[PDB]
PDB file of C-alpha atoms and ligand atoms in Angstrom:
ATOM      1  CA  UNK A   1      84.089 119.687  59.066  1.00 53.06           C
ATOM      2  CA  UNK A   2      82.125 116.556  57.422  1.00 51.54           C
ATOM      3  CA  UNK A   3      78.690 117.049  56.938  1.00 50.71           C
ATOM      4  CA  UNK A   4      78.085 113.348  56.311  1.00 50.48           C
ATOM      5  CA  UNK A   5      79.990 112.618  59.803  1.00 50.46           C
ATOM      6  CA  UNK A   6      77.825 115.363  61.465  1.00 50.35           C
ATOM      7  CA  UNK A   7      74.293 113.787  60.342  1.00 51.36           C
ATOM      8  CA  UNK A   8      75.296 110.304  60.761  1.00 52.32           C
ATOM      9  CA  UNK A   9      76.691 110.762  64.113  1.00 55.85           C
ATOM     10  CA  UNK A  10      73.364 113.025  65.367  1.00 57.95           C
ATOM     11  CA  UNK A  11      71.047 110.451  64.249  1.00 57.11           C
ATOM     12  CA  UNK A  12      72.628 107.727  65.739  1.00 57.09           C
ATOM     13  CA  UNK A  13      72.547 109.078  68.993  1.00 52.38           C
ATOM     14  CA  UNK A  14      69.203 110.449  69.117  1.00 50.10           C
ATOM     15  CA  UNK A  15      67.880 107.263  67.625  1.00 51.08           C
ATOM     16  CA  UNK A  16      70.488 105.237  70.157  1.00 48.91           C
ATOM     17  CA  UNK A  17      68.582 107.651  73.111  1.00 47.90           C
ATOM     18  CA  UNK A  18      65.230 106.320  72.246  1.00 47.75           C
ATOM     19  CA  UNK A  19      66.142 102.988  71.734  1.00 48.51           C
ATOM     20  CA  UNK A  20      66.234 102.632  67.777  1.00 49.52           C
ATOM     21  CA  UNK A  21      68.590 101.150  65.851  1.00 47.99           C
ATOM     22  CA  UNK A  22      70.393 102.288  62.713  1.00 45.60           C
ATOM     23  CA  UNK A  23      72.946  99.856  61.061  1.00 50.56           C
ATOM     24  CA  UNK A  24      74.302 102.038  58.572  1.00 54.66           C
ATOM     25  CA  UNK A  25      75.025 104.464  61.535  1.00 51.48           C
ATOM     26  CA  UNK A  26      76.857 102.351  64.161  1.00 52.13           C
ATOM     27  CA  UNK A  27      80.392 103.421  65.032  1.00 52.37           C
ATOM     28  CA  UNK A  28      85.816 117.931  65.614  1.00 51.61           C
ATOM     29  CA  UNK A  29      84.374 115.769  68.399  1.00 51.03           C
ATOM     30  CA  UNK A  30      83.225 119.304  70.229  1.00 50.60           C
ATOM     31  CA  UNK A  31      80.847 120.005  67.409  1.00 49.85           C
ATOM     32  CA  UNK A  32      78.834 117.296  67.330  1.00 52.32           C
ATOM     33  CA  UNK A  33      79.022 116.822  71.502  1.00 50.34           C
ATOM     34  CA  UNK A  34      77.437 120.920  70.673  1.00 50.91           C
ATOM     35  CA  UNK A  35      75.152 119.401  68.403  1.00 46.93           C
ATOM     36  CA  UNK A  36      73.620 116.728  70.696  1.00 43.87           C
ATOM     37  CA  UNK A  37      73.359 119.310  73.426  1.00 42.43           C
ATOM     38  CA  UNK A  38      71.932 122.277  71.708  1.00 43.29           C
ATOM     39  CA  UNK A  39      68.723 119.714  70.422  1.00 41.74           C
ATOM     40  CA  UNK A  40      68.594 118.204  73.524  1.00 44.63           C
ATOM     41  CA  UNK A  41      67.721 121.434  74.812  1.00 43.09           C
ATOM     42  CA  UNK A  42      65.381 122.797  72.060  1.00 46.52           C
ATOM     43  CA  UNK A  43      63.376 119.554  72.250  1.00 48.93           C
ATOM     44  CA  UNK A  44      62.941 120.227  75.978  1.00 46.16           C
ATOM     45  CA  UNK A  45      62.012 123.720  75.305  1.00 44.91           C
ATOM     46  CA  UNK A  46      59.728 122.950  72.348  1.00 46.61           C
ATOM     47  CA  UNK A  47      58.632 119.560  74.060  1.00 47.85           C
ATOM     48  CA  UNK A  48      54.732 120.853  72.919  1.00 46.72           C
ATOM     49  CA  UNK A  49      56.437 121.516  68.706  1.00 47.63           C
ATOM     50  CA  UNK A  50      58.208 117.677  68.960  1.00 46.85           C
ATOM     51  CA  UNK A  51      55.092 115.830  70.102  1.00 46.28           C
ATOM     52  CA  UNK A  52      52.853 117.633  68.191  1.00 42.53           C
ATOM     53  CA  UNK A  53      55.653 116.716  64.920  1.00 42.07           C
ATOM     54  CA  UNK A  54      55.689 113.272  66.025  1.00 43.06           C
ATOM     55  CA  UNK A  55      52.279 112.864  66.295  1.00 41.14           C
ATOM     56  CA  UNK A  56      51.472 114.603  62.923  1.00 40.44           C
ATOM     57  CA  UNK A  57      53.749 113.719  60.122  1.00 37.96           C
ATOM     58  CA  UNK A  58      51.901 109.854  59.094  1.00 37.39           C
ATOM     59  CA  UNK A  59      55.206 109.301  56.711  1.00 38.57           C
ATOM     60  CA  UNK A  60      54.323 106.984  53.383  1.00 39.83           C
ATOM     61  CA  UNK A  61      57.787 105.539  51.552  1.00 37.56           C
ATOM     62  CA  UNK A  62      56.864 107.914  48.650  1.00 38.48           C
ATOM     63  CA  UNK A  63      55.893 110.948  50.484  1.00 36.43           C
ATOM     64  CA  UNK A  64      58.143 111.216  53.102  1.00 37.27           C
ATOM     65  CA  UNK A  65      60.819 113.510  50.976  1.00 38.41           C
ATOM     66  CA  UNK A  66      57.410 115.345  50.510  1.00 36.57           C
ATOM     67  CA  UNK A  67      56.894 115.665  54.601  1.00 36.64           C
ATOM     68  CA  UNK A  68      60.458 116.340  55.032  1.00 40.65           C
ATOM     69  CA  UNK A  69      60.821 119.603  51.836  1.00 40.35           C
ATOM     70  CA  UNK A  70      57.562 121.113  53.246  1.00 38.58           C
ATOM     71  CA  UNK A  71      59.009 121.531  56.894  1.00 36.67           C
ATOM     72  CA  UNK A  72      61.789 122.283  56.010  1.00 36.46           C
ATOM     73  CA  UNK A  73      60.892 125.301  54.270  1.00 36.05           C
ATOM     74  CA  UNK A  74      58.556 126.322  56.857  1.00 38.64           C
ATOM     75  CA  UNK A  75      61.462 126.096  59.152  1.00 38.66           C
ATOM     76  CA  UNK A  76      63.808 128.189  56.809  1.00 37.21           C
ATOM     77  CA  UNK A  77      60.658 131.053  55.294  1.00 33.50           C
ATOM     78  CA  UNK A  78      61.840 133.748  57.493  1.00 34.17           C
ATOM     79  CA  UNK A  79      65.761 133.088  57.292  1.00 34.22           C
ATOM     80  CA  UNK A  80      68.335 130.969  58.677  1.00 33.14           C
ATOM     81  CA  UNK A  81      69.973 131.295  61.536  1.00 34.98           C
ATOM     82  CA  UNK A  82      71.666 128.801  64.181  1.00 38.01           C
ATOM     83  CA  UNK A  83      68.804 127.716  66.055  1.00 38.50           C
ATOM     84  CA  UNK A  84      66.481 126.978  63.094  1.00 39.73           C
ATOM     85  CA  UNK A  85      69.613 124.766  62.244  1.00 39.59           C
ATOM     86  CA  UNK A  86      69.018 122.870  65.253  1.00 41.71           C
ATOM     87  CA  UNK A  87      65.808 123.010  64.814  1.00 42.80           C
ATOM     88  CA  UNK A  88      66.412 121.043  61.270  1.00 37.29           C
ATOM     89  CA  UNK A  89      68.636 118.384  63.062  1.00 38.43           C
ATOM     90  CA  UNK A  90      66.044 117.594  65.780  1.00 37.24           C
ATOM     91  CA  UNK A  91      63.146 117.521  62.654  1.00 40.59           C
ATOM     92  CA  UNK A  92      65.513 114.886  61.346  1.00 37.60           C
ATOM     93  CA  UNK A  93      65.441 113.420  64.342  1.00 33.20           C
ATOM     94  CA  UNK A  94      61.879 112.744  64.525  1.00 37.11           C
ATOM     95  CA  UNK A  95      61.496 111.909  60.983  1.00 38.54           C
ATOM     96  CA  UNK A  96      63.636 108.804  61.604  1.00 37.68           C
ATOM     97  CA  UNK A  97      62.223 107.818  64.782  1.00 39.23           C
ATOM     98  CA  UNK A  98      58.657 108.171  62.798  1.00 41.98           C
ATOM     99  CA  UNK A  99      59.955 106.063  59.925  1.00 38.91           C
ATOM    100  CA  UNK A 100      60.706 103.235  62.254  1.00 36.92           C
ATOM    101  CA  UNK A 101      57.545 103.388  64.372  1.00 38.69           C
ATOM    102  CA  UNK A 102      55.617 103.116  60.695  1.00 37.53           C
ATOM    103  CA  UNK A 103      57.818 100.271  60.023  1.00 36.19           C
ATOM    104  CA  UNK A 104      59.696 101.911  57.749  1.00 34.22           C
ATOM    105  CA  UNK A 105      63.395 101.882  58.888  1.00 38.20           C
ATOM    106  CA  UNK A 106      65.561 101.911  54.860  1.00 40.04           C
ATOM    107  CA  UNK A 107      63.984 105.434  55.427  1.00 43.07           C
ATOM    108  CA  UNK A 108      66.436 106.603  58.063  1.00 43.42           C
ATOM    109  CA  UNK A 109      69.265 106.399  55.282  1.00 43.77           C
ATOM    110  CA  UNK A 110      66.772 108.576  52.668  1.00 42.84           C
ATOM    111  CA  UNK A 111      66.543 111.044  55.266  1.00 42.52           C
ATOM    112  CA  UNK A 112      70.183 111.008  56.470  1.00 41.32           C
ATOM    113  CA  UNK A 113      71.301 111.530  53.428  1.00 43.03           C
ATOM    114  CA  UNK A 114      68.672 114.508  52.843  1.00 44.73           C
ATOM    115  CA  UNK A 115      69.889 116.304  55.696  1.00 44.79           C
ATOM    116  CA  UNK A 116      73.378 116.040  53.996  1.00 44.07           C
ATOM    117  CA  UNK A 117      72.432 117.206  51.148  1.00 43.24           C
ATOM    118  CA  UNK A 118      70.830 119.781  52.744  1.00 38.80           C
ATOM    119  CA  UNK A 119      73.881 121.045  54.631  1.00 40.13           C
ATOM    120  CA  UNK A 120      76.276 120.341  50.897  1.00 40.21           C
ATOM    121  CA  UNK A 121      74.055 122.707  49.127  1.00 39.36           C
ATOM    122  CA  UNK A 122      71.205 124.606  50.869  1.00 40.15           C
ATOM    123  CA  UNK A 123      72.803 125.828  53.984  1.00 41.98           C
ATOM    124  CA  UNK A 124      76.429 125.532  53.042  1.00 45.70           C
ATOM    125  CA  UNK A 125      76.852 129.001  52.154  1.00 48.93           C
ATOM    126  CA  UNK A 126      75.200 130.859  55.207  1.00 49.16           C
ATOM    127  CA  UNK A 127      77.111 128.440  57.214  1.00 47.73           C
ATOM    128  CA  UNK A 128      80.454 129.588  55.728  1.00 47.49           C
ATOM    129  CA  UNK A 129      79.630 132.467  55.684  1.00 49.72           C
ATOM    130  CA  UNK A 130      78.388 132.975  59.103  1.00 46.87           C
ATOM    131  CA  UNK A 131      81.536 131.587  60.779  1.00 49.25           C
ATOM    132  CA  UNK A 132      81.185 127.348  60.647  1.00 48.90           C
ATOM    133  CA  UNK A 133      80.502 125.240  62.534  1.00 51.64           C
ATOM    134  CA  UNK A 134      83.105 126.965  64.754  1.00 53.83           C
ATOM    135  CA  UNK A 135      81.518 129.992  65.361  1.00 52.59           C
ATOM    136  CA  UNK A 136      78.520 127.681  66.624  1.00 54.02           C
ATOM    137  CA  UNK A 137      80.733 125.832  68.789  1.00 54.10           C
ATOM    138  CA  UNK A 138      81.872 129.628  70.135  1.00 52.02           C
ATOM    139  CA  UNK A 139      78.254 130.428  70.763  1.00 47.98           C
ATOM    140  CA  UNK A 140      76.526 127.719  72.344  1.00 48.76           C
ATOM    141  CA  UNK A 141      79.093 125.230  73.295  1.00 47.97           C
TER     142      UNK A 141
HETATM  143  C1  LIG B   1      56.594 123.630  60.716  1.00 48.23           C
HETATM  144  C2  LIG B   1      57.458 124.126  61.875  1.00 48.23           C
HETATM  145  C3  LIG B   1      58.501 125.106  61.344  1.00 48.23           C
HETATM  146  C4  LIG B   1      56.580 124.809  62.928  1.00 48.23           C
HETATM  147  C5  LIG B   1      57.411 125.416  64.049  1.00 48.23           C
HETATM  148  C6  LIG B   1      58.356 124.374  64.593  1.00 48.23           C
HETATM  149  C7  LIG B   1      58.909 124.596  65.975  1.00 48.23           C
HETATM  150  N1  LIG B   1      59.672 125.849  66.141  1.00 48.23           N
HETATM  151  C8  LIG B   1      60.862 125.875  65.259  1.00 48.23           C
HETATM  152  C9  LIG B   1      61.675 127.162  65.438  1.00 48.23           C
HETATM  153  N2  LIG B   1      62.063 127.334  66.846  1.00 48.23           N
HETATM  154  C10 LIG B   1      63.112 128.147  67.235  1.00 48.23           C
HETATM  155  C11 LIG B   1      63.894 128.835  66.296  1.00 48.23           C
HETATM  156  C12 LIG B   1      64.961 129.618  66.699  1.00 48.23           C
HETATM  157  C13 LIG B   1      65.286 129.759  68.054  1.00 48.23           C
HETATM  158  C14 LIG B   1      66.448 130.621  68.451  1.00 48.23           C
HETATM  159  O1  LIG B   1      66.561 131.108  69.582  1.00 48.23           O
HETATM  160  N3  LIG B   1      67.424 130.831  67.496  1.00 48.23           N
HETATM  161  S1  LIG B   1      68.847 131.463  67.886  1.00 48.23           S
HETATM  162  O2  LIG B   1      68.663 132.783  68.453  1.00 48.23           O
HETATM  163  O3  LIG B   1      69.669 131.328  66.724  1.00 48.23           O
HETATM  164  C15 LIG B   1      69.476 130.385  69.165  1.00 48.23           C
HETATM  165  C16 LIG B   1      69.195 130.612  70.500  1.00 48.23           C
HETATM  166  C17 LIG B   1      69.648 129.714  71.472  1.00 48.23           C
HETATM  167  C18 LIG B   1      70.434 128.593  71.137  1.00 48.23           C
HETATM  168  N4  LIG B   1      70.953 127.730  72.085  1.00 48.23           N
HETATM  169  C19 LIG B   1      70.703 127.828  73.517  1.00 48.23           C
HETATM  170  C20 LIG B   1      71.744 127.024  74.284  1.00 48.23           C
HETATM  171  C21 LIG B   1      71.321 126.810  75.733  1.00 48.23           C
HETATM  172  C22 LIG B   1      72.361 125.978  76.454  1.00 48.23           C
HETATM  173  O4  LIG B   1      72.536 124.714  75.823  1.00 48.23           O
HETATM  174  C23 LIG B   1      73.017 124.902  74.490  1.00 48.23           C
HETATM  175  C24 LIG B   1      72.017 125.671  73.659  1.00 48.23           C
HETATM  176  C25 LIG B   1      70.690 128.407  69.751  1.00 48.23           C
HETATM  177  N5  LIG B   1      71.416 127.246  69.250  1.00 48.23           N
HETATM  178  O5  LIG B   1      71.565 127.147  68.035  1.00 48.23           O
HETATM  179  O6  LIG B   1      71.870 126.439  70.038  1.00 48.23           O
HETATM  180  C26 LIG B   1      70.230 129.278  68.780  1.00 48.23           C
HETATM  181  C27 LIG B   1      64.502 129.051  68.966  1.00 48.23           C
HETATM  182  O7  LIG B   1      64.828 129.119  70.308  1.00 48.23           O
HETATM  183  C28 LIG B   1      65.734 128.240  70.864  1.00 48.23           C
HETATM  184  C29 LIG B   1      65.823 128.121  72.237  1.00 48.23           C
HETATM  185  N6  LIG B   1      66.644 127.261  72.856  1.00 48.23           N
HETATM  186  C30 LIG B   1      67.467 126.541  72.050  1.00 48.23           C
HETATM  187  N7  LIG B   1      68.345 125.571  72.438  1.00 48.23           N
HETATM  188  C31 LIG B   1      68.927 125.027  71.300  1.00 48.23           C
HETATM  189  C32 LIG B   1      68.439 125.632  70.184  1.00 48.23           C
HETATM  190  C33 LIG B   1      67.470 126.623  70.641  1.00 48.23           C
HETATM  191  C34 LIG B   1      66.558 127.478  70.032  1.00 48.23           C
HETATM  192  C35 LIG B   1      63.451 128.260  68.570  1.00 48.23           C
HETATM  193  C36 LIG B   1      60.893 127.288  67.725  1.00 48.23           C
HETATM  194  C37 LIG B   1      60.136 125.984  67.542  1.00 48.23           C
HETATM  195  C38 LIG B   1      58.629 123.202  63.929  1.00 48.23           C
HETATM  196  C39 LIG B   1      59.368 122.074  64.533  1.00 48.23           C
HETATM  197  C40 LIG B   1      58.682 121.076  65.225  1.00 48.23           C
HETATM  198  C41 LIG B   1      59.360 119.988  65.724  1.00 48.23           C
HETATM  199  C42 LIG B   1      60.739 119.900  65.585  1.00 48.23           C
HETATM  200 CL1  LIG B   1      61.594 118.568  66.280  1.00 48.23          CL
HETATM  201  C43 LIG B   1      61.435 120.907  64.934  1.00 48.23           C
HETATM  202  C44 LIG B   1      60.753 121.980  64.411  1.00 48.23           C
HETATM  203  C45 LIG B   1      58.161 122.936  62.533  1.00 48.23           C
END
């Protein structure tokens, strides 16, 4: 599994959904259909959580990695486990659909590449060790 594939192709469709653009993200297939579902359907269940994050964050160019490190350890304070990942990709989400609504859009490839980083070094070894991304394609796809 590519981590940089998974991130570039969930950004590009949730920005594609809402009518963004992202150049740098114009273009195993199971996991990231998985993806696409599983934060379609927490951002319908936590509809209240994503406009209340949309409405909130008020991203800057130098304190958006700032915005993005203190929800993300919110997120994460109590553990990890497969929804709080989704969780993370649908914050990502809304981070980059922020960042163009500020007129901001170079920061859709800071934050892209923070969520990949994220995934390389953060989460890479509860993901492992929890089973992969194929034991989250077993679950919930
Ligand atoms: C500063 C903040 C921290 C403040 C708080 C918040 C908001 N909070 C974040 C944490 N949160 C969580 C966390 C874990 C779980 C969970 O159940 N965990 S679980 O047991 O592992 C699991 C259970 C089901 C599925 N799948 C169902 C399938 C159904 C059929 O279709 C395929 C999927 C998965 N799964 O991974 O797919 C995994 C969960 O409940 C669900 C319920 N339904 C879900 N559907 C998909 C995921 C999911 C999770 C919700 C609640 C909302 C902030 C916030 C704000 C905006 C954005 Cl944008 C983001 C965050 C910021």
């Amino acid at each position: 599994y590519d981590n940089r594939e998974i991130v570039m192709k969930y950004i590009h469709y949730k920005l594609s959904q809402r009518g963004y653009e992202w150049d740098a993200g114009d273009d195993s297939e199971v996991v990231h259909l998985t993806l696409r579902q599983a934060g379609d359907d927490f951002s319908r269940r936590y509809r209240r959580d994503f406009a209340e994050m949309s409405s909130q964050l008020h991203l800057t160019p130098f304190t958006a990695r700032g915005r993005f490190a203190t929800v993300v350890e919110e997120l994460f304070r109590d553990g990890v486990n497969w929804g709080r990942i989704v969780a993370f990709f649908e914050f990502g989400g809304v981070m980059c659909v922020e960042s163009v609504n500020r007129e901001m859009s170079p920061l859709v490839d800071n934050i892209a590449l923070w969520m990949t980083e994220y995934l390389n070094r953060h989460l890479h070894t509860w993901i492992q060790d929890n089973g992969g991304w194929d034991a989250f394609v077993e679950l919930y796809g």
